[PDB]
Write a protein that binds this ligand. Sequence first.
Ligand SMILES: [Mg+2]
Lengths: 517, 561, 485
Amino acid sequence: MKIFSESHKTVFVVDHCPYMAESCRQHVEFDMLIIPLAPISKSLWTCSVESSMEYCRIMYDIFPFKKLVNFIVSDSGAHVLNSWTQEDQNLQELMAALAAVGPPNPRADPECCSILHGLVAAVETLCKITEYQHEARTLLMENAERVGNRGRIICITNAKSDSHVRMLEDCVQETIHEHNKLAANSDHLMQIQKCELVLIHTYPVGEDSLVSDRSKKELSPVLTSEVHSVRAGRHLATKLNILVQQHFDLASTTITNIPMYDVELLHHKDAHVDFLETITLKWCTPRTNNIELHYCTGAYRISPVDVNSRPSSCLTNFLLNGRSVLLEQPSKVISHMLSSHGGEIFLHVLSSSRSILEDPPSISEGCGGRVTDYRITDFGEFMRENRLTPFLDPRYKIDGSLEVPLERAKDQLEKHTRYWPMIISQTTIFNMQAVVPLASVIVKESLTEEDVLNCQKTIYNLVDMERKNDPLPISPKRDEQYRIMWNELETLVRAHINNSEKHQRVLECLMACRSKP
Amino acid sequence: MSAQGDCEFLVQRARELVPQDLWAAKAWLITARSLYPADFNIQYEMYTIERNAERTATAGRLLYDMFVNFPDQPVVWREISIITSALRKQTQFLRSLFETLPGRVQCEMLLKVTEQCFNTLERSEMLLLLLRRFPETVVQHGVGLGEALLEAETIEEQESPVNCFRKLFVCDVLPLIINNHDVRLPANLLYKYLNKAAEFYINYVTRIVDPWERLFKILNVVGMRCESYGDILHRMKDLCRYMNNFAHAKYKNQVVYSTMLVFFKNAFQYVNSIQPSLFVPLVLLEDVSNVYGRNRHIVVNKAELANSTEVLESFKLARESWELLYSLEFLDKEFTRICLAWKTDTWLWLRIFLTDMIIYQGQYKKAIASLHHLAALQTLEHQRALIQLATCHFALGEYRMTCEKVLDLMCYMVLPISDLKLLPCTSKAIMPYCLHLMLACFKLRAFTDNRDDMALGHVIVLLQQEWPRGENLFLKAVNKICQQGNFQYENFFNYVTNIDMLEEFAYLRTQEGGKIHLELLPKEDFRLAMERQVSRCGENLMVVLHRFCINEKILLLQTLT
Amino acid sequence: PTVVVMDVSLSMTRPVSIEGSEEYQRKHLAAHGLTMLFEHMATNYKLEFTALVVFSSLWELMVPFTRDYNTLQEALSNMDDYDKTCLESALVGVCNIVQQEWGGAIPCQVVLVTDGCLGIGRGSLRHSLATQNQRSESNRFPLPFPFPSKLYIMCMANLEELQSTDSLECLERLIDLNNGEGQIFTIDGPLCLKNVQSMFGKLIDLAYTPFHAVLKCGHLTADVQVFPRPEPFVVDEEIDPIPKVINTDLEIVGFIDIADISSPPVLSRHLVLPIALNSANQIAGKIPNFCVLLHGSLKVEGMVAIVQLGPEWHGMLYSQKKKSNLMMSLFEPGPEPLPWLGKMAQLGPISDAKENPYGEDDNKSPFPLQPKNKRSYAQNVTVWIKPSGLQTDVQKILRNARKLPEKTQTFYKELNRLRKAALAFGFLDLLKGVADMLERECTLLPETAHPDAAFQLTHAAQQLKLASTGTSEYAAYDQNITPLH
Ligand SMILES: [Mg+2]
């Protein structure tokens, strides 16, 4: 839908009771190369944190903006780890905050807390306004109602029994009801329109699933709870991977035949509306400069599902170094292209079907097609002198009004074409090297004193050639050629008098020094 | 000298002076009367002079004196006859002079006139006028006058009960006799009174101010003497519940007479609402509406009859009354006796109501017999019996007599446009009814797992009416064609002017409906006729369906199943 | 593209009660209307691909997508009259041909030359509309075309009277499952040729009128035509729901080297062609046009020409077998459609820069703009979900321990990464295990007995097993481990 959908606001609630401190019974074997040590294992807190942060990493890679997350560990209190500003939505801040929270207390107070505090703080968090929501509300003056506050809460906890799940769902429904009632009166707290819930229950491998799965169940016209049960370790990570794929409408790609194994990527599902559960695009041999402007119907950010691994790291390093990669679908047709546009790897979806703009009318038949003296190199110089560059800092024009650089570009483009003949045979002042300083300076807005001196030198040199009657380009008596060239020079200069006063000075000099009987 | 000559001379002298001096003539007449008080000529001359002078009192006194003294003079009889004729400016003066005479004198003069009367009708009229003027004499004259009128009517051998003497007796003599409390009459005579009054009332209304109100009042008076039209029926039903369970002549006489009276009133209202001439016609039918798929309801639109509720209520009331009349033995016997005493021809309206009631009842063989009787006695307007026989035959699964009745129904029906219905006798409603009947007959003929194909063709052709309601019926027919694969109907292209039907039949002939072998002609020829037949889509569907009905009248051979 | 789906059932072979003139079948009226449409689309819309699909009991493709409107004109009078009406199969065939020729994003206007008879059963329109709409299953109703379509229904059945006596809600619903992208056209009044021509003129005005524009580069102007006509775009349905069309005047604002723009995602690619506002090759073919100069210079220098199609909407103009022509592509409407160029309203002239960003000899370029936050493939993240990642981390830890004290900086960087990840995950048991591995590696030192190697390894092991306890000595996240001098 729009920007303000359920995926625009996602809150993570991770349990932090001493229940999430026992090992997950999935001993790791980091000891490979006498008698090895006892294998290490990760707590349920560690597994939930790892999987949640992988979810966050994938979302941040594919959606750098307009998709935010809130991280709420649920302990004795409810410690919110980051805010809704698009500056605390950073992985490094989240790792710092989780390190501050630390491992769950094993022997402080086992049954003094629960998870419901995290959920109450999460629903109290869904009411706040993201900076994008505030901007939309302040833009929709007197109509700031078509901006939803839909969200989503993900809860990873070691539920004791199914009744615990049901009372958690009752608690969250009650919290949304009460907080909606509270936010109806107030103004700086939005009313939640849809708060989907996920209540992933994690248990060690080998223990019975004391809580069974349950499909989506609408507890309200504002809630839709769904319960998952999955073993801690790799299964929980896979569950949250499926969750991130289905929350943001992601898709998978399995790029193969990479010259040195497969590499899996995660992008938006819109990149696979052309082909139509992972596509298997095959790497194609890159050419140096075969073509440079491909017709891409969409560019989507990607994120490796195995980023640290050697094949995906090799592919991403190759892409980041500067070159691109063309991918083919299963004679062969090129359907995609991976390009890194300045440290951001993109997946372009090229078009391989018939072009409706095929066999277009020849430019040699249309209007002006039978003309062979076009100032094509002159216009090339015009194009290359009127290029575009980005400006970071804002500049002030006079007072209280900063200049939009696009407006400056358009003003310059209009300025440089006040007098600009099209065919070579039309113009004569633009066909000799003497007037190059005059042409390249007069079009400017503010002339330096050296520029004025150069214009004076050019005018005096033109007078000298007139005195010597050096033949002019063909582009029609010897004196008539110089008379018409002076007339064209006056036409050029007379059109730029409004730029400044030095243009007026050079115009007066030109009028005085021209050979006008 | 005889006194007659002197009296004549005095009369001549008085008469001669009348044009000159009325006072002198009056004085001469007075002197002559004083001289000869027994001279009737002088009294007659004085009476004539007083009448010519427009003097009411003097003329009345002279006339009374002449009548008292000289009743044998034919001039007195002529004057009495003239006065009676005037009573039955000069007429007003004569009527005023009549009031001058005493009531006893007027009664005596009326009695003398009645005695001297010769014609039966004139004597009856004079007696009725005298009774109206002097009710005191009706005690010993009212019954005799009515008896004499009835005897004269019987002797005159009047074919119809509409008789002048009977009409006078019912209108005037009967109410006068009934209202006379001093006059005592037996209940057996009240029976004859009410019989003749009812006969007169129904004969007048079937064929005046209010025959129905007069008959109802007479019935109420007769019922009270022996002691709305709807409440009395239920009251009499309660009386039956108090009497029918166990000579008791009063109760049986009531249960016959009052019930038959309300029955006849409701029946007249019914047959005046439907077929108003017999008092566009309305025919009670059984129009099967779901072709494409005791206390019953008559479905009738309020547009064709703006007062349907009251008419239906009257029909229900009359049906219940007639059912009660034939329910128990004594009332049934007495009702049959009185009805067969009257005209057994049953007229037309009563027969129509009886046929409608039988068709309502549920028995249709007796209904068909009654309709044969009605037709013998007798879509246009008159051809109601045809429609009624059509529905009656269709009721008892006949499915063939219905078909000939329908086919003959529309022979006199030319116009370019189950549930007990009630439709007019116009094409707009009748023609769909006939086509529904024929479609039902052929639908039950064709969908019987047999090898018949003309039946299926007749279903298809008659399915054009009221589209797209026959959508599922035609789809089932096409499925049957696909199963069989050998449809044969040479008449198919002469009547099926439906683009949906045509383009479904051309579907069957290429690949995907199966190459069904369609014998619709009596390779290129089949499509060549189809190109022509699609040009006929637009012609009046009713007209082509009627042409199919009349020209292809050989539907019957298939319909015999 | 344009798919002309035309009925050929028996319902369309019905003579029309037209006064005065001879009887025309409705197929003839359809043929005349399509004839005039093809005349207009071959005189003023010559660059459009049109395909004629005839449907009855089964769909058929008479002529494939072609610009040879004489071929389509020939086909109009070369048709048969297969009977029965089936529309769902026709729409299935339309989807098949559209997706098999153009793909899944090229718009396709579908001109359904229907009749209004709908059908009777089986695959009829009422049956398939009532059943398959709520039935789904394998055989889905192909009405919401899988491409930006616009279904026009040219129901040539009198006024909407003949449509309202039997059924018009069915057709108006048929348009509705296309998300309202369509228009019902009904022959006003009688079925005289003038009225069917009026209906097809309404269609021509609604769908096949060329998009004339003006191309400007300051004062250098050109009266151009953009094919196809750009389709309106909506940003979203909550903030900016109204559709925004491009500006009639394409304003070139600047030029970006075709290597600096790289390959930009675009909404749709368009063809800019000059128009005149053997005559066309002698009067208008000799006056110099701006599109020809622009195309030549763009092809030679190898550049694009950024175009302002509206407020906060920007485009691009470039060059282009061998046949090249001026081309134009619409970027997505927004402040920053191309993140490697920054906000398009922050692009300005190079004359306002301090130096020349492109370089004195054109060996540099300001583009591409690096994003603020490096993505996970640019930083050094620590993923330990799969055991292989953790094993690789510890093996890299131990391998650099043998190379100590030669590779001490990389070793300490790797160990600091490991400790930071362990603390942020609460994986202290990994820390104590790694300390024990450091001790084991110290025990296996070579006989050369490098002096600094033992000291640094022992100090790192001490710090590791002191941080593994969790006390506030070195368990702080930012307390990076420092070696021994
Ligand atoms: Mg059709």
